[PDB]
Amino acid sequence: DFTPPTVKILQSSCDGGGHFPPTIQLLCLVSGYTPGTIQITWLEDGQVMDVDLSTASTTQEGELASTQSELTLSQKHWLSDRTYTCQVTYQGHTFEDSTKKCADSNPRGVSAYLSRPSPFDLFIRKSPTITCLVVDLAPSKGTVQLTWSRASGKPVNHSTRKEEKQRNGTLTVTSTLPVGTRDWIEGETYQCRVTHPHLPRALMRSTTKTSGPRAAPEVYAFATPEWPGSRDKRTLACLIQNFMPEDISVQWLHNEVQLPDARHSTTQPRKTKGSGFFVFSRLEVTRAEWEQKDEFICRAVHEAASPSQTVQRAVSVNP
Amino acid sequence: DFTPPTVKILQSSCDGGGHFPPTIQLLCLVSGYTPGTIQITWLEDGQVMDVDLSTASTTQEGELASTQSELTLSQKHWLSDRTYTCQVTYQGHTFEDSTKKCADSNPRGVSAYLSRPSPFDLFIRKSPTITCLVVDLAPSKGTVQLTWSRASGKPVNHSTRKEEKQRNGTLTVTSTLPVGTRDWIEGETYQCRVTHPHLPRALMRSTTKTSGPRAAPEVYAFATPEWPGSRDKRTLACLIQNFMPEDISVQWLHNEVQLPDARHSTTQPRKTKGSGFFVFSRLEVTRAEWEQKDEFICRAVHEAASPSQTVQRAVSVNPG
Numbered sequence: 001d002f003t004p005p006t007v008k009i010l011q012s013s014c015d016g017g018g019h020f021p022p023t024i025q026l027l028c029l030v031s032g033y034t035p036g037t038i039q040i041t042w043l044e045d046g047q048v049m050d051v052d053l054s055t056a057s058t059t060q061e062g063e064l065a066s067t068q069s070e071l072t073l074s075q076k077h078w079l080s081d082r083t084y085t086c087q088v089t090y091q092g093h094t095f096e097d098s099t100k101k102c103a104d105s106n107p108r109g110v111s112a113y114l115s116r117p118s119p120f121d122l123f124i125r126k127s128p129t130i131t132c133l134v135v136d137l138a139p140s141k142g143t144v145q146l147t148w149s150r151a152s153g154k155p156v157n158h159s160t161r162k163e164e165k166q167r168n169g170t171l172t173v174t175s176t177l178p179v180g181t182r183d184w185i186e187g188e189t190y191q192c193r194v195t196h197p198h199l200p201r202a203l204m205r206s207t208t209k210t211s212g213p214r215a216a217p218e219v220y221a222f223a224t225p226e227w228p229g230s231r232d233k234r235t236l237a238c239l240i241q242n243f244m245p246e247d248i249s250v251q252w253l254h255n256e257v258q259l260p261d262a263r264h265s266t267t268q269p270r271k272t273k274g275s276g277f278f279v280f281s282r283l284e285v286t287r288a289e290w291e292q293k294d295e296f297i298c299r300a301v302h303e304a305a306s307p308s309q310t311v312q313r314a315v316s317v318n319p
Numbered sequence: 320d321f322t323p324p325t326v327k328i329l330q331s332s333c334d335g336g337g338h339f340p341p342t343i344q345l346l347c348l349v350s351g352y353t354p355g356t357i358q359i360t361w362l363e364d365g366q367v368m369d370v371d372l373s374t375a376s377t378t379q380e381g382e383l384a385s386t387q388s389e390l391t392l393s394q395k396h397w398l399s400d401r402t403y404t405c406q407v408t409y410q411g412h413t414f415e416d417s418t419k420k421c422a423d424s425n426p427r428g429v430s431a432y433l434s435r436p437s438p439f440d441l442f443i444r445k446s447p448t449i450t451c452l453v454v455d456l457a458p459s460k461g462t463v464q465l466t467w468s469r470a471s472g473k474p475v476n477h478s479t480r481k482e483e484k485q486r487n488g489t490l491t492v493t494s495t496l497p498v499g500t501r502d503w504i505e506g507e508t509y510q511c512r513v514t515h516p517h518l519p520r521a522l523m524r525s526t527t528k529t530s531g532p533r534a535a536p537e538v539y540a541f542a543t544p545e546w547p548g549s550r551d552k553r554t555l556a557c558l559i560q561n562f563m564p565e566d567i568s569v570q571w572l573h574n575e576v577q578l579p580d581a582r583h584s585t586t587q588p589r590k591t592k593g594s595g596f597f598v599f600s601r602l603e604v605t606r607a608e609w610e611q612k613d614e615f616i617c618r619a620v621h622e623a624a625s626p627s628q629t630v631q632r633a634v635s636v637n638p639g
């Protein structure tokens with residue numbers, strides 16, 4: 001029934017063109033907590049700021065109370081990389097949160113990408129995985145460090161790096177940390193921190209399960225009519241659509257045996273003209289295969305599908 | 320008196336280290352708006368986003384109303400620099416506010432791209448042009464000199480130029496040049512050359528008819544079945560494959576109208592299995608549309624298609 005105070009900071013957003021506002025407001029929120037003596041103080045690089053600079057108010061609703069504090073900063077100050085801490089003292093105890101201008105996302109043309117677990121792995125193979133790919137940089141001296149960490153601080157299995165210099169003259173490091181199935185589904189957060197000796201500071205990407213509403217995919221499989229010239233081959237295509245989140249896995253099975261991934265392609269999830277995503281899968285098939293057993297199954301693994309997180313539709317070439 | 324609403328968008332703050340949260344929450348605050356119904360709407364790049372990913376809250380306590388709507392995004396999504404908008408509707412005209420990832424400290428440099436005649440312009444309109452686009456230009460001081468030329472040395476037509484200031488303060492200069500069909504078709508190579516005092520050495524991009532083998536595209540138009548979940552709209556799909564080279568234009572024709580590009584979602588050419596390239600197109604049609612004329616044709620334009628660089632298939636949502 002007791003609800004400790006929780007601290008979080010919101011900030012003025014950027015221009016529709018990513019431009020900073022003349023002034024930056026930092027709104028500190030201490031939402032839904034068991035009413036009690038509370039105080040909110042702001043720190044700029046570890047020091048207490050003038051009371052005249054932040055306006056604080058608290059209100060209650062029912063069994064819990066909520067309070068907020070707004071601080072205005074000169075754009076010049078916000079851009080100087082000074083750190084600002086919202087310090088809350090609830091019932092004599094201290095709760096804190098900090099922020100500073102967001103660092104460059106693409107330092108020196110460089111890019112970083114951390115991805116979530118594919119649905120097949122998470123549900124079918126039951127061996128979840130997250131891959132951290134860092135690209136768009138040039139070879140220097142010192143090596144590149146990719147460490148994995150969990151928000152919960154809880155340990156993390158042993159990852160695996162594997163860079164591979166590219167043609168355009170850049171390097172591409174890629175590590176793949178394995179995650180705890182349960183761990184991931186519970187909403188854990190896995191961050192991928194990378195310190196490049198050539199690059200200024202540390203670049204960091206964080207990943208966790210989607211939160212939005214779920215919606216199972218609709219699966220429709222079609223077989224191309226015979227096309228003049230190519231009589232022993234046929235193409236299968238299935239549209240899997242109107243599903244959420246966008247994360248999905250597509251597999252094809254023939255003769256109760258699932259075929260190898262290289263046997264077909266699948267587009268990237270793209271939104272529908274309404275709610276949800278759609279994907280197209282294509283399987284080039286052969287006469288030997290359909291005269292074998294004339295049924296091919298387009299299977300989709302999505303977290304919203306039930307009972308076993310999968311939905312499928314079979315198709316046959318002949319009528 | 321009657322107090323006019325005001326939209327403001329706050330966002331998740333970064334780490335104490337300047338790192339982003341595993342997910343970014345955007346909070347839209349339309350405050351002061353005098354009590355009364357109101358419709359908040361989010362837009363991801365102009366596209367209206369289904370309200371299945373939002374939440375309206377309101378407390379017109381004391382007097383004037385104040386409602387807020389929050390939208391959440393994954394780090395990736397946010398990092399893709401997609402621009403988000405929050406639309407309020409009150410007394411007719413809608414009010415709004417937009418936001419995007421803040422521009423990194425050091426802004427990039429100029430990059431030039433040279434497109435190629437689209438199969439459509441080349442074979443349907445028979446009026447092909449190649450475009451030269453210079454992006455991320457530092458305006459104010461100086462101006463970019465973009466000049467065309469042919470490898471044959473022959474004369475080039477007059478091109479038209481366009482200069483557009485982007486919301487991120489960068490500049491875009493678009494020179495688009497009419498080219499001869501016979502000339503393009505026969506291998507003429509065109510070069511675009513960019514210059515500017517705030518530019519080290521001159522830039523140069525060239526373009527010429529794609530080389531290699533040719534293969535005519537195959538076209539298949541399908542229709543998803545009618546079911547209780549989609550009864551006043553239907554999803555059409557089309558698969559165009561095994562064509563070479565990659566260049567191809569895809570449209571959906573209906574009732575003698577060439578639907579807007581925006582109407583459909585068409586993928587970019589991927590290698591089949593060496594057999595050539597393939598593309599997938601998906602179009603959502605409405606009852607009104609098929610009741611006007613129950614026939615939608617998927618057309619692909621490709622140089623290798625006989626006899627008029629065109630191949631097409633029609634599909635119907637209803638038993639004729």
Ligand SMILES: *[C@@H]1O[C@H](CO)[C@@H](O[C@@H]2O[C@H](CO)[C@@H](O[C@@H]3O[C@H](CO[C@H]4O[C@H](CO[C@@H]5O[C@H](CO)[C@@H](O)[C@H](O)[C@@H]5O)[C@@H](O)[C@H](O[C@H]5O[C@H](CO)[C@@H](O)[C@H](O)[C@@H]5O)[C@@H]4O)[C@@H](O)[C@H](O[C@H]4O[C@H](CO)[C@@H](O)[C@H](O)[C@@H]4O)[C@@H]3O)[C@H](O)[C@H]2NC(C)=O)[C@H](O)[C@H]1NC(C)=O
Binds near residue numbers: 486
């Ligand atoms: C400030 O804000 C600026 C925007 O407001 C932003 O500028 C953007 O910069 C980037 C790079 O810096 C630019 O990206 C490049 O865009 C090129 C042009 O794309 C468009 O034209 C293409 C060519 O024209 C077609 O030609 C074919 C035949 O060849 C015809 O069939 C067709 O009809 C056209 O004539 C075209 O292919 C593109 O099509 C896309 O859009 C249509 C829309 O419906 C869609 O249907 C298609 O499926 C497709 O998505 C465009 O119309 C492009 O050629 C470049 O491609 C290179 O780079 C990309 C990287 O994404 C890579 O994938 C490619 O393989 C290739 O190497 C590239 O995408 C962008 O155009 C600029 N936007 C502008 C000027 O409006 C600034 O960057 C920003 N500043 C910052 C960083 O803060």
Ligand SMILES: *[C@@H]1O[C@H](CO)[C@@H](O[C@@H]2O[C@H](CO)[C@@H](O[C@@H]3O[C@H](CO[C@H]4O[C@H](CO[C@H]5O[C@H](CO)[C@@H](O)[C@H](O)[C@@H]5O)[C@@H](O)[C@H](O[C@H]5O[C@H](CO)[C@@H](O)[C@H](O)[C@@H]5O)[C@@H]4O)[C@@H](O)[C@H](O[C@H]4O[C@H](CO)[C@@H](O)[C@H](O)[C@@H]4O)[C@@H]3O)[C@H](O)[C@H]2NC(C)=O)[C@H](O)[C@H]1NC(C)=O
Binds near residue numbers: 130133136172266
């Ligand atoms: C110089 O050359 C290098 C050569 O590598 C080149 O590097 C590429 O750089 C681009 C960016 O410019 C990279 O593209 C980005 O890739 C991001 C991640 O994509 C990869 O991972 C996807 C997920 O699978 C991974 O993770 C799971 C989970 O752990 C794991 O199970 C998997 O094993 C795997 O590790 C994967 O889907 C994706 O594969 C693509 O291609 C296949 C082709 O078969 C296709 O089927 C897939 O659907 C997919 O398209 C890939 O392996 C990605 O998140 C990121 O997203 C942004 O860009 C896209 C553009 O399409 C936007 O749509 C989106 O909104 C985001 O903004 C982006 O796609 C690319 O991956 C690098 N290449 C490498 C090494 O993979 C440099 O660009 C060159 N430099 C110069 C000169 O410019």
